[PDB]
Design a protein around this ligand. Structure first.
Ligand code: ZN
Ligand code: ZN
Ligand code: ZN
Ligand code: ZN
Lengths: 190, 620, 586
RNA sequence: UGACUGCUCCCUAGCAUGCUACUACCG
RNA sequence: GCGGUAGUAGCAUGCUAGGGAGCAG
């Protein structure tokens, strides 16, 4: 803002004109002073305006390109995360029972609702009350979905271990009742 | 219609996505390559490749939204809390979610009490609170889908009601738009499951460039992509103590539904003077204009309003299909015949019957609407118009034609029967005639399952126009609900507007020289919003003074009410605003030394700033 | 799109577009590289090309920035701004640059199309990242050159040791032996199908591979060109002689595999690297085997440069070290699978640098330094980050298949950075004990390059033969033939009964194929055939030109045979240097 | 853990247009 | 003598972008 190309000419002309004015010369030198300084300031005006426009344009361009780079970095990391999640969840497919039921299909297509029903290794049961409990998972082994399951653990709504010896009719009102029962496939998968 | 009836015989485990095994660089996957609908039969994908190299970004997005892998890599689940079908459990624990109470603003309550409020025997009292819920509330609320039953329809009458509804939806334009013309507001909201583990919608709208979005949108015109919906509990003020739940749809569904429907949705919300009043505001004389439009030139005017019990849990599937088909009728040039069917199949597989994730488990949604998709309110309006039209048809066709004095109405009834049960193709002249008859004798104003009707009264008494009983019968035999007439009103004096529309009452006041209609809310709602807040930082008024300015804007028209406490609410709000401002200025000048000025701040505690919001002169 | 520039290490966003490897260039460096060189393309988060519709300019010094896009002189708006100004290109982090003065040598590296000796002189004469960039671009240009070849159109097969195979039109016959591996992939209907890892013998096509497939229709034999990944670690890590033996545990007893192996450990236990300077059959094999049990509680890695040279890599390891302590790494081509594959926890892993299970160690051994480039040193230093390691190999061996250079031979000083590192300051180790060899190789290679630090262990009976025959050379194709070999094999087996079961060094593999077709001798590769030599070998004439005979191709060829080393004087060899027995042909 | 729409108020930044003003150039 | 043009300052108007908040279905 102080070393512009026209600054040298403008300042030198102003200094010379004002020295001539301080010399106390005639009115012709004053008119020449006025004209020269007017045109000098007029030419300095656009040189002082266009540069300021250009700097702000350049700054906006820099900011936009920086934010584009940040967006690309975020895209790369989200792609890596999705790939990792897929390849991690792949490793639990039990690729022998799944293959055994896929090959029985006449064209390779099977409903999705029967894959956990015939290939899962673990079963989870949520029981509202004792009357429902004694009709579904009474004892230590029960049958569901044409398979045999054996109990492995029982917890309550607070996630604390509960032993089957205290799930009775008298002791029912002393438990956080949304009980969760975990079982394993017997003779088949786990 | 026939598929709906025939699908009730076959086992329920043979419906849904169909999966198979594909190979990517020698490793086996499990992906969905089709669907088996209860209504649309068997649908197979068109672009499926078994052997492929390393996959791209949009393939990752598609494979990460499919429920196939999540269901196949999870444990079996047998849930006895509900009677809906259960698929699998994604973890080893069950999640129980509670709802917390509200926060008490003691300063406002003390200020209100010190001014003669909340006395015994008063007509203004608090009945809006924050209710708390226990652990097993989300599943208990989800178990209300048991009211959705398979319903067969009268096809020869639905095929005419749909024509009349399409006549109603005729003044708009629509079609498909490119990915660079989509307008999204608030990109800082959730993206659904499983996309909420890595960021909000901003991350996925920035990481995806324009031709990626275009390719993804063009992918769903030849394939079906099933997704997963997450259920969340609301934390808001209310007057009843039942839990409220909304549905969070996945990003892959919203991103394409916007490109499919946004042009028509924006064209609907920009028209004034139509039947659907979505987009019209109530400030600057909007309410008066809407009320004058709905009155039209009916001859013996009465007013009527009704209510839908369990509107979204009990709406049959066929009406949702009809609403989607009616909305998708603007694509006669931009889309082919197979593209439209595949778009319909995608919509059905994503927002009508899909896997929902409640707690930490996957369930099967029987039917109904999932409030939270990209086209909720407009579909609700289409459904409301359809129900009104069939109620009118049933009212007219079930009248002894030997006692109709007017011969024009008798000929109209004869032609209606002929066009329903003796004509196989559309007859446009009679559709236009019936539409004109309905618009002359039965005027409606619809906003997403809320409606006000101005109808001819002598015609309704003689049975030539629908009544409340007709709505009750239609709801009973077509919606599987009972509509008690204790939630419906009727007004025989037009100088007092509708008894209730969008939770607002109507009063006819004199402003300027003429008389206009103004809406006012329930005072208890305003006071409850004042006294009970979510967040702790809103129990310090000086930090947020702009809350009370908006609350006083909402409560202005209460000063014209003949009852006296109603105006006292507005005056109390103004005095509290002034007290808060004085507190801020003095409380800041004291310990610090910053001196505050009261330039153009006194406008907020004088009535002229608020009076200008209900006077017809558009501003800003 | 964001990283450090190869000279100032400052953050940049500009990629040069005229260099095949697209390096990261600093803004001042970008200006210097674009001004003093005809590299006039620059890439950023968006390309620096004119975006005016219908226009096509790809300069950088010609464009003007206007609005949000980039424009040229013919489409600059009234609000324009030149990108190339102030001697500094417009990009991110433009105010946090420092510049550099090493731009002339960087320009030479970038501009060098790899033609003459000075190419490798300046490749080995620069700073670290320039060495890495030069090695990367050298492998890039050689792999592009070899992928600029046709596809072997095959539709039928005669039998084993026979083949009809056709190249493309306008494409010449590719190089012959396993030094240029033939691994192709055919198609059945929709994708590619397996063919086999093979190599061709002559033009009759015998199979020197290691499998047999039902080869016929639609077969595509190709010299598979592989995409080169960028380097991470430098070619070598500067060593510092330790005082503590951290992790290393000299056992209470002495596992006396070899005697001087104690000194081996004594000076390899403190410096960050070492090297096994081994003449052929002079302890180049099992000093690491002794180290295996003297330092049994130290994670020890073994590697080589080619899948062919795994003989001593794999034999004594299972022969004498415990079974479980060994481990195998093989991609799944055909090689020794003697140890266990798919095992991450072990103390003795044996493999090549092709593919390893990423881990770090504290002791490594690395074989075949002669045909090893700085790229291989960098990749072994990146995959394995250890505390000490040894590079087995000797300068008195063969260079890598650097067919790129044609004018000047690549001498010991130009093998790689380490191979001259031990040349200038001296080798880390120097042995002088030949395991089983008469003193012929002693005299020869000790007068030539061994400086006579090893002397006569086995007696010199002077049964080896060298004659006065010269030979005549004739070129036909990229392989040549020798009439004074088609006749000379017979003329040299006329009555001498000792070299009938000798091995045939192959400066020209086609000549060896013809010799096998006519008389019949085993084919012996030149570069990747160390340790496969038998007790008895013939060094044949096979050439007179600068193909093989300056110094360093026969330094190991003189050691192929043990007692009967028939090394006839072929061409301008080291004739008047020693004593050799001779018999004159009739 | 926080869905889809619609309307309204407040604060800051930029752009466009208009009004007035102060110098200077030109006829 | 009048007008045009070039900067500079204050004021007003409508859009776009960002942030905070309120109501309704
Ligand atoms: Zn369309
Ligand atoms: Zn370059
Ligand atoms: Zn630099
Ligand atoms: Zn151009």
């Amino acid at each position: 803002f102080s070393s512009l190309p026209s600054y040298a000419a403008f300042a030198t002309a102003q200094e010379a004109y004002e020295q001539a004015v301080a010399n106390g010369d005639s009115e012709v030198v004053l008119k020449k002073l006025k004209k020269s300084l007017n045109v000098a300031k007029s030419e300095f005006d656009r040189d002082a305006a266009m540069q300021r426009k250009l700097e702000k344009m350049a700054d906006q361009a820099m900011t936009q390109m920086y934010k584009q780079a940040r967006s690309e970095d975020k895209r790369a990391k989200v792609t890596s995360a999705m790939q990792t999640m897929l390849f991690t969840m792949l490793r639990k497919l039990d690729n022998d029972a799944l293959n055994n039921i896929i090959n029985n299909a006449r064209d390779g297509c099977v409903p999705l609702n029967i894959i956990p029903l015939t290939t899962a290794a673990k079963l989870m049961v949520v029981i509202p009350d004792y009357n429902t409990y004694k009709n579904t998972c009474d004892g230590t082994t029960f049958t569901y979905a044409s398979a045999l399951w054996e109990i492995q653990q029982v917890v309550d709504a607070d996630s604390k271990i509960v032993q089957l010896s205290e799930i009775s009719m008298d002791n029912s009102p002393n438990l956080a009742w949304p009980l969760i029962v975990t079982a394993l496939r017997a003779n088949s998968a786990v | 219609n026939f598929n709906v009836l025939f699908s009730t015989v076959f086992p329920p485990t043979s419906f849904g996505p169909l999966v198979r095994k594909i190979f990517v660089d020698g490793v086996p996957f499990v992906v969905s390559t089709g669907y088996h609908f209860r209504e649309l039969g068997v649908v197979h994908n068109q672009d499926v490749n078994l052997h492929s190299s390393r996959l791209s970004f949009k393939e990752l997005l598609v494979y990460a939204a499919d429920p196939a892998m999540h269901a196949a890599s999870g444990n079996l689940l047998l849930d006895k809390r509900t009677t809906c079908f259960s698929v699998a459990a994604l973890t080893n624990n069950v999640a129980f979610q509670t709802v917390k109470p509200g926060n008490f603003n003691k300063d406002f309550y003390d200020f209100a009490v010190s001014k003669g409020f909340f006395k015994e025997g008063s007509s203004v009292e608090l009945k809006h609170f924050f209710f708390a819920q226990d652990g097993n509330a989300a599943i208990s609320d989800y178990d209300y889908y048991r009211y959705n039953l398979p319903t067969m329809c009268d096809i020869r009458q639905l095929l005419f009601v749909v024509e009349v509804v399409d006549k109603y939806f005729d003044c708009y334009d629509g079609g498909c738009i490119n990915a660079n013309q989509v307008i999204v507001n608030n990109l800082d909201k959730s993206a659904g499951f499983p996309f909420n583990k890595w960021g909000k919608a901003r991350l996925y709208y920035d990481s995806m460039s324009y031709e990626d979005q275009d390719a993804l949108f063009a992918y769903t015109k030849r394939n079906v992509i099933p997704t997963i919906t997450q259920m969340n509990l609301k934390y808001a003020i209310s007057a009843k103590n039942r839990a409220r739940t909304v549905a969070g749809v996945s990003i892959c569904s919203t991103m394409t539904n916007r490109q499919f429907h946004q042009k028509l949705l924006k064209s609907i919300a920009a028209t004034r003077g139509a039947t659907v009043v979505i987009g019209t505001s109530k400030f600057y004389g909007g309410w008066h204009n809407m009320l004058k439009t709905v009155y039209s030139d009916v001859e013996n005017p009465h007013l009527m309003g009704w209510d839908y019990p369990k509107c979204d849990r009990a709406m049959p599937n066929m009406l949702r299909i009809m609403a989607s088909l009616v909305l998708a009728r603007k694509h006669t040039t931009c889309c082919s015949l197979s593209h439209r069917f595949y778009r319909l199949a995608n919509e059905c597989a994503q927002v009508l019957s899909e896997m929902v994730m409640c707690g930490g488990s996957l369930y099967v949604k029987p039917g109904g609407t999932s409030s939270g998709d990209a086209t909720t309110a407009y579909a609700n309006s289409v459904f409301n118009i359809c129900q009104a039209v069939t109620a009118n048809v049933n009212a007219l066709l079930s009248t002894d034609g030997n006692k109709i004095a007017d011969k024009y109405v008798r000929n109209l009834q004869h032609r209606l029967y002929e066009c329903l049960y003796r004509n196989r193709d559309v007859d446009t002249d009679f559709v236009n005639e019936f539409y004109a008859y309905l618009r002359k004798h039965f005027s409606m104003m619809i906003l997403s399952d809320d409606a006000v009707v101005c109808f001819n009264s002598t015609y309704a008494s003689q049975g030539l126009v629908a009544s409340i009983k007709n709505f009750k019968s239609v709801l009973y035999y077509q919606n599987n609900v009972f509509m008690s007439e204790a939630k419906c009103w009727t007004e025989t004096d037009l100088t007092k507007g509708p008894h209730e529309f969008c939770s607002q009452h109507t009063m006819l006041v004199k402003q300027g020289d003429d008389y206009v209609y103004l809406p006012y809310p329930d005072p208890s709602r305003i006071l409850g919003a004042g006294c009970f807040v979510d967040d702790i930082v809103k129990t310090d008024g000086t930090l947020m003074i702009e809350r009370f300015v908006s609350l006083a804007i909402d409560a202005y028209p209460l000063t014209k009410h003949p009852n006296q406490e109603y105006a006292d609410v507005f005056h109390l709000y103004l005095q509290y605003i002034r007290k808060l401002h004085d507190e801020l200025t003095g409380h800041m000048l004291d310990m610090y030394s910053v001196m505050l000025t009261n330039d153009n701040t006194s406008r907020y505690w004088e009535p002229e700033f608020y009076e200008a919001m209900y006077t017809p002169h558009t501003v800003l | 799109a964001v990283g450090a520039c190869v000279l100032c290490n400052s953050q940049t966003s500009l990629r040069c577009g005229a260099c095949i490897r697209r390096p990261f260039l600093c803004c001042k460096c970008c200006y210097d590289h674009v001004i003093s060189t005809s590299h006039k393309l620059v890439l950023s988060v968006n390309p620096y090309v004119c975006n005016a519709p219908g226009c096509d300019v790809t300069d950088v010094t010609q464009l003007y920035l206007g609005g949000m896009s980039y424009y040229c002189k013919s489409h600059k708006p009234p609000i324009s701004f030149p990108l190339c100004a102030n001697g500094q290109v417009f990009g991110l982090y433009k105010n946090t640059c420092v510049g550099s003065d090493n731009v002339t040598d960087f320009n030479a590296i970038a501009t060098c199309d790899w033609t003459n000796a000075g190419d490798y002189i300046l490749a080995n004469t620069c700073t670290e990242r320039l060495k890495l960039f030069a090695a990367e671009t050298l492998k890039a240009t050689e792999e592009t050159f070899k992928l600029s070849y046709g596809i072997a159109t095959v539709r039928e097969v005669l039998s084993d040791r026979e083949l009809h195979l056709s190249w493309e039109v306008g494409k010449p016959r590719p190089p012959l032996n396993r030094n240029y591996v033939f691994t192709g992939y055919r198609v059945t209907k929709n994708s590619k199908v397996q063919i086999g890892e093979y190599t061709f013998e002559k033009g009759a096509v015998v199979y020197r591979g290691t499998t047999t497939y039902k080869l016929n229709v639609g077969d595509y034999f190709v010299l598979t060109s592989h995409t080169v990944m960028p380097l991470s670690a430098p070619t070598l890590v500067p060593q510092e002689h330790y005082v503590r033996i951290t992790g290393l545990y000299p056992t209470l007893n002495i596992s006396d595999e070899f005697s001087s192996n104690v000194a081996n450990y004594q000076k390899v236990g403190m410096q960050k690297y070492s090297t096994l300077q081994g003449p052929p059959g002079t302890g180049k094999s099992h000093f690491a085997i002794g180290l295996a049990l003297y330092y049994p509680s130290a994670r020890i890695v073994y590697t080589a440069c080619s899948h062919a040279a795994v003989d001593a890599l794999c034999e004594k390891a299972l022969k004498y070290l415990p079974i479980d302590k060994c481990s195998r790494i093989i991609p799944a081509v055909e090689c020794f699978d003697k140890f266990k594959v798919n095992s991450t926890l072990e103390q003795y892993v044996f493999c090549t640098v092709n593919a390893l299970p990423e881990t770090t160690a504290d002791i490594v051994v690395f074989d075949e330094i002669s045909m090893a480039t700085n790229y291989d040193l960098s990749v072994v230093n990146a995959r394995l980050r250890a505390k000490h390691y040894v590079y087995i190999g000797d300068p008195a061996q063969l260079p890598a298949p650097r067919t790129l250079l044609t004018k000047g031979t690549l001498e010991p000083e130009y093998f790689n950075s380490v191979c001259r590192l031990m040349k200038t300051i001296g080798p880390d180790m120097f042995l002088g004990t030949c395991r089983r060899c008469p003193a012929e190789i002693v005299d020869t290679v000790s007068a030539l390059v061994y400086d006579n630090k090893l002397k006569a262990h086995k007696d010199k009976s002077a049964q080896c033969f060298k004659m006065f025959y010269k030979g005549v050379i004739t070129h036909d194709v990229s392989s040549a033939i020798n009439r004074p070999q088609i006749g000379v094999v017979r003329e040299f087996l006329t009555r001498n009964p000792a070299w009938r079961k000798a091995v045939f060094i192959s400066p020209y593999n086609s000549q060896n194929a013809v010799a096998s077709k006519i008389l019949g001798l085993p084919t012996q590769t030149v570069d990747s055939s160390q340790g496969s030599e038998y007790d008895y070998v013939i060094f044949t004439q096979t050439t007179e030109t600068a193909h093989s005979c300056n110094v360093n191709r026969f330094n190991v060829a003189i050691t192929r045979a043990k007692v009967g080393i028939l090394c006839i004087m072929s061409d301008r060899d080291l004739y008047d240097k020693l004593q050799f027995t001779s018999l004159e042909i009739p």
